[PDB]
């Protein structure tokens, strides 16, 4: 296995998906692993299935139950199909359509379409079935940091970029993209999480370690907090009835927050960058973080 763990995503059933990159040494590749025992990770010897990619992995997402969508350094988006027994991970397609590192992917509410965000500034809408690009949108002026699909709508998704713009999309409009966010130009957006039970509101984290709560409808920054000392690299909402927000950072800390962004838990178990987090669908008080310190920590959330 490669040293730098990038992605960590629990399936419906409780299986753990791991994306990882080589970010130093002779080979700068990547790999995808499945761990039917989530407590057995990161150990290669006790893994259910694993595979080597041509090149590293910037972001990763489930495409249902046997589908893995990969954002490759190579500028390719990769769909990996699981085996009929779930022992193998086989390349379904690998399409070189971006001109620079694919840095983010997100699957749309349907799950036959997805949206990628590259460092080439373009965002693209994908048909996972036909394996082609439907739309190619150059909305931004800088490398695209994060794209996040609407939980419940195919035509709607967020994106943010080093050009300081957060774009609400809607592929139904003839001018799809729309620029929202706080009054003045704050610090750059870094991470986007939709709210699971209010498809009207979302949260974005900035490069200055501030997480902010936003109402699209009301397009006004209701609330924010100084959670991390450094850039906010990922945000995941708990599957809980009234959900918790998990904020990842380059300050090597996990924080979990309520609905007014007050601090509840805090974990410095990581001693390198915290990269991803998924909540256990089986125990809604378990949360599984990975980092660049090759650790796979399982947290108990009060």
């Amino acid at each position: 296995m490669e040293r730098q763990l990038e992605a960590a995503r629990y399936r419906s059933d409780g299986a753990l998906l791991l994306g990882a990159s080589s970010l130093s040494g002779r080979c700068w590749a990547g790999s995808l692993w499945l761990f039917k025992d989530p407590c057995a990770a990161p150990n290669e010897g006790f893994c259910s299935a694993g595979v080597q990619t041509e090149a590293g992995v910037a972001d990763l997402t489930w495409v249902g139950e046997r589908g893995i969508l990969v954002a490759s350094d190579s500028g390719a988006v990769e769909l990996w199909e699981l085996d009929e027994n779930e022992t193998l991970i086989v390349s379904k397609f690998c399409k070189y359509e971006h001109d620079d590192i694919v840095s983010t992917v997100s699957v749309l509410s349907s799950g036959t379409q997805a949206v990628s965000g590259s460092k080439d500034i373009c965002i693209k809408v994908w048909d996972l079935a036909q394996q082609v690009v439907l739309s190619s949108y150059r909305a931004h002026a800088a490398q695209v940091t994060c794209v996040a699909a609407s939980p419940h709508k195919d035509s709607v998704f967020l994106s943010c970029s080093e050009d300081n713009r957060i774009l609400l999309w809607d592929t139904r409009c003839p001018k799809p993209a729309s620029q929202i966010g706080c009054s003045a130009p704050g610090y750059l957006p870094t991470s986007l999480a939709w709210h699971p039970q209010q498809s009207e509101v979302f949260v974005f984290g900035d490069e200055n370690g501030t997480v902010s709560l936003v109402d699209t409808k009301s397009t006004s920054c209701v609330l924010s907090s100084a959670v991390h000392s450094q850039c906010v690299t990922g945000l995941v909402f708990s599957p809980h009835s009234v959900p918790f927000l998990a904020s990842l950072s380059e300050d090597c800390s996990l924080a979990v927050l309520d609905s007014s962004l007050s601090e509840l838990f805090r974990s410095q178990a990581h001693r390198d960058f915290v990269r991803d987090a998924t909540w256990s669908p089986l125990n809604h008080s378990l949360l599984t973080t990975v980092g660049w310190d090759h650790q796979v920590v399982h947290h108990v959330v009060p």
Binding site: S24, R26, Y96, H98, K119, P176, R271
Partner: protein, 625 residues
């Protein structure tokens, strides 16, 4: 054919990846020296103490490969002009790290982006690195023709793209370079890698990049149209630009994945190759001067100094000049000696500055072409050349030619001349002191005598070239004024420069100059309409001369005698470059000055700002009488 490299942001195995690009046909690879996504902490524990290695080993390539094949790229996460203190400090240390590693590998170049307006800290850090011991490494600043913000799809419903003429706005990308360049004090190790987008902007935007030190032109695979067969190609307007860049001999980089997934990567390359081989092949002038492009030379002074054999040899390797001289003499003989008088009137014909006697031969060829009698003198003060004349005179010319070995100002002539034929012209006409020479030689012209030439006129035009302004800056020598190099003219085949206005005439001289109050000093004021934003770096000088009637020589690019390679233009630089905004007028002032011993030019810019008077009292440059 084209020196061309590949830009990648993904290198799994450097040995394989390099192997691939070399087989595809590339001459070098631009790649990251640390993994692009591998951000690193320098201040804050714990990430600070991240175990190494921090990148791949230098052992993976030969020093030879590193020195010749690998251009480094600054990791795109490194942002020294962030608004965040922590990301600034971190990127500072991160940037020195990446550059110092490039230096450690002895990489020929290292790429750094300009893609915002404020790159102040980026410049500081680069400049800091540069002044850390004199290393050969080049820095390629990656700059777009068009800022991505002004290229974006009009798809933000509440932030639409302005559909209004923004003349200065559309140039903003050049101002990014200009500022960065200026902050780094015009360092010679800082060049432009010009990134070309899908849609080209207005010519005036493209024209801003003339005179600029473009070492690279980056072409994304995006911008390639697809023809019937499947091959990638470029628009006719893209093709024009490629031709402009080929004459600058830029290295072409190809960035981004293959979007013509039927053809190999040797396709994109093979189009550039097809384009270079299918250009107007080099004419007589362009093929002769193919080495001398922007090569500063001190102006010859054939009066004060004695020209070397091989100097005269190239003066003589110019058939068009002597065709024109032969004709000019031919037409003068007929106009002077009526047909009926042919065998009774012999013309006394005096070459002044005969060198090794190509004018003496022209004078013979012109006399038996016009069927008239001529008696030849050959006045030449260069005794080394006079060796070559006397050997001609004894072997071939006989008593017809009477070689004289003295200054035309001193020579007491036996008889007076019908025709005095001279060649004492410099790139700026009067800058070899043809005026002063043919003045001291006027007394032995008959009261009805011709001079060939009878008239010459100098021409000045303001130019922009941060390239030539840097070549002059580089000419500071110990044991003299530190700025002396700006207060003197250079003969130079100007190239990678921008004519900012049409040449106007500066100084004119007539021969004979019958004038009772003979004064060869001059004060000319010129006013240059400038219809672009640009930066003044000096004035190109050319000349025109009337040999006889409608036979003329010119190096003035408009009226340039075709296929004549005896003169390159002269360059009058200025110490501080001057900003000139579209519609403003460049007012320049020139003085030809002299005492008993020296002739020199002083020059000043009086608009839109005043320059310092250049070369006052000939302190930095004089011409010996």
């Amino acid at each position: 054919r084209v020196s061309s490299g590949r830009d990648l942001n993904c290198v799994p195995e450097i040995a394989d990846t390099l192997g691939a690009v070399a087989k595809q046909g590339f001459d070098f690879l631009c790649m990251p020296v640390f993994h692009p996504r591998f951000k690193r902490e320098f201040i804050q524990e714990p990430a600070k103490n991240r175990p190494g290695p921090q990148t791949r080993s230098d052992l993976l390539l030969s020093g030879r490969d590193w020195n010749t094949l690998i251009v480094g790229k600054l990791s795109p996460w490194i942002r020294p002009d962030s608004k965040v203190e922590k990301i600034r400090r971190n990127s500072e240390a991160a940037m020195l790290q990446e550059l110092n590693f490039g230096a450690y590998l002895g990489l020929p170049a290292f790429l750094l982006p300009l893609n915002q307006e404020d790159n102040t800290n980026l410049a500081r850090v680069l400049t800091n690195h540069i002044h850390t011991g004199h290393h050969s490494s080049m820095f390629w600043m990656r700059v777009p023709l068009v800022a991505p913000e002004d290229l974006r799809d009009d798809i933000i419903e509440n932030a639409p793209t302005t559909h209004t003429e923004e003349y200065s706005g559309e140039e903003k990308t050049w101002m990014w370079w200009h500022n960065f360049r200026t902050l780094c004090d015009y360092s010679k190790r800082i060049a432009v890698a010009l990134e070309i987008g899908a849609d080209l902007p207005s010519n005036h935007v493209i024209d801003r990049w003339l005179g600029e030190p473009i070492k690279a032109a980056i072409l994304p695979t995006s911008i390639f149209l697809t023809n019937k067969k499947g091959f990638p190609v470029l628009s006719k307007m893209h093709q024009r630009l490629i031709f402009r860049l080929l004459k600058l001999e830029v290295q072409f980089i190809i960035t981004g994945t293959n979007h013509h997934s039927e053809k190999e990567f040797c396709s994109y390359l093979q189009y550039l190759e097809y384009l270079s081989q299918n250009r107007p092949p080099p004419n007589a002038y362009e093929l002769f001067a193919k080495g001398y492009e922007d090569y500063l030379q001190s102006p010859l002074q054939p009066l004060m100094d004695n020209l070397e054999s091989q100097t005269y040899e190239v003066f003589e390797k110019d058939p068009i000049k002597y065709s024109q001289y032969q004709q000019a003499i031919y037409k003068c003989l007929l106009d002077r000696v009526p047909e009926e008088e042919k065998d009774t009137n012999v013309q006394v014909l005096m070459v002044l500055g005969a060198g090794r006697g190509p004018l003496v031969n022209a004078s013979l060829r012109a006399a038996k072409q016009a069927d008239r009698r001529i008696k030849l003198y050959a006045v030449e003060k260069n005794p080394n050349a006079v060796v070559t004349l006397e050997n001609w005179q004894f072997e071939e010319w006989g008593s017809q030619v009477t070689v004289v070995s003295s200054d035309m100002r001193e020579w007491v002539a036996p008889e007076k001349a019908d025709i005095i034929v001279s060649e004492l012209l410099g790139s700026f006409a009067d800058n070899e002191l043809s005026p002063e020479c043919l003045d001291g030689a006027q007394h032995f012209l008959k009261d009805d005598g011709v001079s060939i030439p009878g008239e010459y006129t100098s021409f000045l035009a303001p130019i922009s070239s941060s390239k030539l302004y840097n070549e002059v800056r580089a000419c500071r020598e110990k044991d003299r004024d530190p700025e002396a190099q700006f207060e003197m003219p250079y003969v130079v085949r100007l190239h990678n420069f921008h004519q900012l206005s049409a040449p106007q005439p500066c100084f004119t001289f007539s021969h004979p100059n019958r004038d009772p109050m003979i004064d060869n000093n001059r004060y000319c004021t010129l006013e240059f309409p400038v219809e672009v934003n640009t930066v003044l770096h000096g004035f190109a000088g050319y000349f025109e001369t009337v040999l006889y009637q409608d036979i003329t020589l010119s190096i003035r690019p408009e009226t340039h005698s075709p296929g004549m390679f005896s003169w390159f233009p002269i360059l009058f630089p200025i110490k501080q470059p001057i900003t000139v905004r579209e519609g403003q007028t460049i007012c320049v002032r020139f003085w030809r000055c002299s005492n008993s011993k020296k002739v020199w030019y002083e020059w000043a810019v009086t608009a839109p700002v005043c320059s310092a008077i250049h070369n006052p009292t000939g302190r930095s440059y004089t011409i010996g009488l």
